[PDB]
Amino acid sequence: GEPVYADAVLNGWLTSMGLGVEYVRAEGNTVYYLDDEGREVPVLDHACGFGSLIFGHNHPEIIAHAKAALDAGTVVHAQLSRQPRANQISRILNDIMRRETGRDDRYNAIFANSGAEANEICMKHAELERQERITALFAEIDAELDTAREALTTGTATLDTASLPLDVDGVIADIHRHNDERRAERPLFLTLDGSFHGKLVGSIQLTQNEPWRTPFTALSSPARFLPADEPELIGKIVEDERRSVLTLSLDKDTVRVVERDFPVVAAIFVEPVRGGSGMKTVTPELAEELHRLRDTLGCPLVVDEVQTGIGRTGAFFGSALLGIRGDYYTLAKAIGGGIVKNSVALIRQDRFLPAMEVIHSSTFAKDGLSASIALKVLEMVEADGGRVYQRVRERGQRLEAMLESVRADHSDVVSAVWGTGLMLALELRDQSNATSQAIREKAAHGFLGYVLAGFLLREHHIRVLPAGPRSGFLRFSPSLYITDEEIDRTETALRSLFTALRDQDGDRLVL
Amino acid sequence: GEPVYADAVLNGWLTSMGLGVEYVRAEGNTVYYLDDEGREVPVLDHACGFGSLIFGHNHPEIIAHAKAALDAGTVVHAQLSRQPRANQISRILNDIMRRETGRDDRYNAIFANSGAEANEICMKHAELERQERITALFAEIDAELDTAREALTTGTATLDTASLPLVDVDGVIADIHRHNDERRAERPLFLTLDGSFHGKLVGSIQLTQNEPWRTPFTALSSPARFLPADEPELIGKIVEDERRSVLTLSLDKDTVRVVERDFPVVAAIFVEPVRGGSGMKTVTPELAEELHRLRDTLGCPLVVDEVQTGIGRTGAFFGSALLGIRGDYYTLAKAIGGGIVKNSVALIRQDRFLPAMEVIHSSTFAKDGLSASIALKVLEMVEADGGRVYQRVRERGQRLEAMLESVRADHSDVVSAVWGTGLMLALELRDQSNATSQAIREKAAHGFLGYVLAGFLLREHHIRVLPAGPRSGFLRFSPSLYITDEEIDRTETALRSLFTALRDQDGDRLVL
Ligand SMILES: Cc1ncc(COP(=O)(O)O)c(C/N=C/c2cc(O)cc(-c3ccccn3)n2)c1O
Numbered sequence A: 001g002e003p004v005y006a007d008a009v010l011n012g013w014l015t016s017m018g019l020g021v022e023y024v025r026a027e028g029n030t031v032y033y034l035d036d037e038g039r040e041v042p043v044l045d046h047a048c049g050f051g052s053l054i055f056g057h058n059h060p061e062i063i064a065h066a067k068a069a070l071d072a073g074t075v076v077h078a079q080l081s082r083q084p085r086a087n088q089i090s091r092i093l094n095d096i097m098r099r100e101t102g103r104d105d106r107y108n109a110i111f112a113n114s115g116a117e118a119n120e121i122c123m124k125h126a127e128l129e130r131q132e133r134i135t136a137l138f139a140e141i142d143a144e145l146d147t148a149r150e151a152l153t154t155g156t157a158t159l160d161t162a163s164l165p166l167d168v169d170g171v172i173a174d175i176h177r178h179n180d181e182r183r184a185e186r187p188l189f190l191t192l193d194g195s196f197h198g199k200l201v202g203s204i205q206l207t208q209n210e211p212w213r214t215p216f217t218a219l220s221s222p223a224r225f226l227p228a229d230e231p232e233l234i235g236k237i238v239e240d241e242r243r244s245v246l247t248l249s250l251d252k253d254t255v256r257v258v259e260r261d262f263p264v265v266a267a268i269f270v271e272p273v274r275g276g277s278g279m280k281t282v283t284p285e286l287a288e289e290l291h292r293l294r295d296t297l298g299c300p301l302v303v304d305e306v307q308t309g310i311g312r313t314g315a316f317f318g319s320a321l322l323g324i325r326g327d328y329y330t331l332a333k334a335i336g337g338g339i340v341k342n343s344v345a346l347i348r349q350d351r352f353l354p355a356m357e358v359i360h361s362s363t364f365a366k367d368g369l370s371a372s373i374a375l376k377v378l379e380m381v382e383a384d385g386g387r388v389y390q391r392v393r394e395r396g397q398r399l400e401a402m403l404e405s406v407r408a409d410h411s412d413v414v415s416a417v418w419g420t421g422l423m424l425a426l427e428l429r430d431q432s433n434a435t436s437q438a439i440r441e442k443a444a445h446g447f448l449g450y451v452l453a454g455f456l457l458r459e460h461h462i463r464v465l466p467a468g469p470r471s472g473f474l475r476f477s478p479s480l481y482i483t484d485e486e487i488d489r490t491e492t493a494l495r496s497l498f499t500a501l502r503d504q505d506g507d508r509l510v511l
Numbered sequence B: 001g002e003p004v005y006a007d008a009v010l011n012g013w014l015t016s017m018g019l020g021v022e023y024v025r026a027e028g029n030t031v032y033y034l035d036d037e038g039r040e041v042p043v044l045d046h047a048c049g050f051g052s053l054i055f056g057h058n059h060p061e062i063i064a065h066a067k068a069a070l071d072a073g074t075v076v077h078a079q080l081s082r083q084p085r086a087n088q089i090s091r092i093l094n095d096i097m098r099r100e101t102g103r104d105d106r107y108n109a110i111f112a113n114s115g116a117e118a119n120e121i122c123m124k125h126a127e128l129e130r131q132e133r134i135t136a137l138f139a140e141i142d143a144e145l146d147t148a149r150e151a152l153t154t155g156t157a158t159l160d161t162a163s164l165p166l167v168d169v170d171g172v173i174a175d176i177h178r179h180n181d182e183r184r185a186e187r188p189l190f191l192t193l194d195g196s197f198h199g200k201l202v203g204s205i206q207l208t209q210n211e212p213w214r215t216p217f218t219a220l221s222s223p224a225r226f227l228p229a230d231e232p233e234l235i236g237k238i239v240e241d242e243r244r245s246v247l248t249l250s251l252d253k254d255t256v257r258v259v260e261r262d263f264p265v266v267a268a269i270f271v272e273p274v275r276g277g278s279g280m281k282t283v284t285p286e287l288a289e290e291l292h293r294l295r296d297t298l299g300c301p302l303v304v305d306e307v308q309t310g311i312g313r314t315g316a317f318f319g320s321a322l323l324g325i326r327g328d329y330y331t332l333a334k335a336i337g338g339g340i341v342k343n344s345v346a347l348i349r350q351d352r353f354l355p356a357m358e359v360i361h362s363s364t365f366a367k368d369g370l371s372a373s374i375a376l377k378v379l380e381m382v383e384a385d386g387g388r389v390y391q392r393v394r395e396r397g398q399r400l401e402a403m404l405e406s407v408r409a410d411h412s413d414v415v416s417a418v419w420g421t422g423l424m425l426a427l428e429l430r431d432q433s434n435a436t437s438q439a440i441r442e443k444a445a446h447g448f449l450g451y452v453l454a455g456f457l458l459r460e461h462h463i464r465v466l467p468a469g470p471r472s473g474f475l476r477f478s479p480s481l482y483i484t485d486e487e488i489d490r491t492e493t494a495l496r497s498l499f500t501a502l503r504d505q506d507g508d509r510l511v512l
């Protein structure tokens, strides 16, 4: 009953899952906690800051570079002065993308402090684009109404009355009123089912997970969550959302009131590999449908590489690997080197509105320190002729083969292996009908994966965290230094886990 | 015409203002740029990360502590495990706030990565509170409609038809549910002050007055009403305008009426104790009393934004404590990162705090080990030696404000006012849109005046100042507490020079 000032409920919940541990040190793929006697217990980390730690915890190169930057008196706060490192970082990211996509496009960079902030830069810029489109359409409609009013009040044409269900001055004023309502309406964003794009006031609307989002629905523009698995259905859902404004269309003799398209949709967002969905990679059929939508609606396709970028999938850009051709791109997580906080929106230069450079800002964004560490991380992942990507791919193959070998002998409790590169997952089969009460009850609160993670922690000293909407997936996203021995120990631990779960051993799995 | 990949327009604009410089090193209150010959020129920094650097650039204690944390293998990414430092930081902030307000309240802490993110945690939690209130009101209305439907369809009462302009028994109920459903889905409102700056993300930007920053984005997110800080008598009625109501059936034994009940529209009130976007104006006691009334009246939380005013800047830890603003949530950022890392925190009073927020809100980088460690260092430093660091802020602030007043006094033709408190201070410039010099007048008319004048101060006196306020009509002075008497003299000399040239309308000298 002692006063508590943070984290009571969070900690209460972690304890009950068997995840109530304090890690006191970390290096590479290992975090250490203290046992009863006060010695350090090594735990293998497969969570790794939800995929932030492509180079592991506290990589000596990154640590050394950070300490050097600090000792050089790097200018961290230099707001509203020249900061070339921002242009330098963007030049690198531009070259990488050209190399990997074969496209010779150019991107402007705006920096921020988290993946959510970078996605919301993209939301904001998208809505700057949508406002341009809207200004132009309405300028055109003014003119159409000017022209049709010259035709009607001087001779040449008559107002066809069949179209009035949609007096000259009254019809125009009615058209302006209708169009004004429409213009002030909140836009729509399009996302995939299971999408995770952040949990701030704007981005949370873009994140499916229902208990995270639905409390906050009234605050900000919504998204429509398109069904990734059935792209045939997306056409019509998006067709539903079409809205139109009104104008007067002259045809020499006849004037009609007619509907024109209003730009409702500010952006489409996609993750190349869909973390909130259990690490499912976007299929070629889904990519082609997102291209169609982007071409059809004329809004930007925003590719969220907060998790899939910086080498994780076996290239720098997961979008490049899977052939997703976005207009904006976002990066965060691994770009901070496992130690600092940084993110970036890349916005194609032929779409980029220059006002954004001067009307958007952030105190911490583009700071010297995280700029310097960015350039380090980019140097590291690019080094030795792109060998680091090769290494991610061969480590990933190894880890996925293990995981497949485990599914194969445990398909009664494991449905699928998902993902690519070193961004992988096991889908757990539903256990809401489980024989063991305690397991069944946990399945029914959506806590299953956390319980199973607890088992792995206490019995095998392996740190795994669940992914997906009801912790129905187990995440495996270690650093590229994950050893063959560490992968064996993980196989042994999972064979153990899923054998106990086959045996419905509730006493052993739930505390 | 070479390819450019960031910042072209930004840099183009800074150059034309005379602020096109790259600082290559920083220490204390000094940043250094390289001249033509490649030597380091010291420049005195009065901007200091817009008030992030209460202890100056790269303070050796903070740098050392950071390097130690890095060398110890501090766990930066430990998501969904026990992280006591968060509770530890919040305990310290709680004790400080008790000491300074005399109130024995307790606050839960949720961390984030920027001031905007911390304000948006508060926006989210406020809207959780509003949804509780809404659920309760609508449960009550269900029951009232149940009761009035028992009265009408069995005997006792009749539906008074004088009240039907607000909308058959079943039809009136279905009409009431429809009306109430529209209302329930409506976006909430936020209340802010004129000139408010609360961040520039999708949610927070609505809460930031500056019109070119915000109005492009109006359709995205819930809006605010910007209340006139200077005339609190006017706020009552603006907020009255925003009242909205739902419908119910009220039984009075014999008679049933359709009646309006209050709907909770307002999710939160936000306030800065010292209002940066307004030119560093401190909230008056009359305005504080009006914000209390609103908070008591509406039953939504008052969110006190100490992203800038907190961590000692005003001469206490909490500016709110100094000026008697009794908020329900508090936010901190800027100086808590020690000038080197990124961190922020929302403190939400524990008797309002909804426990779901602890498990439905999260962030990858939030609550990381490194910025946690550096937070505890900063808090140790500002608290050290029996609260002497606050004393030092106050005496350095008095010194700097006295200089600035002395300068206004002999230059009241171009300076209207000194504003602010502690080491968060500003000069208000007089309008120059009627200036004799064409070049000055034109700059005044794009709202660039303060930036031009900052450029003068940079190139002619080697002093870094940045403007505040809606059309760069204020000059900010927010240095570290180590600002020396000599550095203050050099600033007086530089400003006397600046405002004498501006008196002389010397456009050639001020504008490039
Ligand atoms: C694809 C993608 N896009 C934007 C973001 C948002 O970035 P920030 O967190 O830096 O704002 C994330 C960050 N991912 C966070 C994450 C990923 C995950 O697999 C689980 C949880 C989690 C699960 C339960 C409770 C709290 N957090 N969080 C992301 O994965």
Ligand SMILES: Cc1ncc(COP(=O)(O)O)c(C/N=C/c2cc(O)cc(-c3ccccn3)n2)c1O
Residues within 6 Å of the ligand: A358, A360, A361, A362, A363, A364, B050, B114, B115, B116, B117, B197, B198, B199, B200, B272, B276, B277, B305, B306, B307, B308, B309, B333, B334, B467, B468, B469
């Ligand atoms: C009171 C208050 N609340 C929340 C915030 C937002 O915090 P973050 O910037 O960390 O998101 C700030 C950050 N203030 C930044 C600032 C303060 C200022 O006086 C001028 C400019 C500025 C002016 C021009 C262009 C870009 N930035 N920026 C603040 O001052």
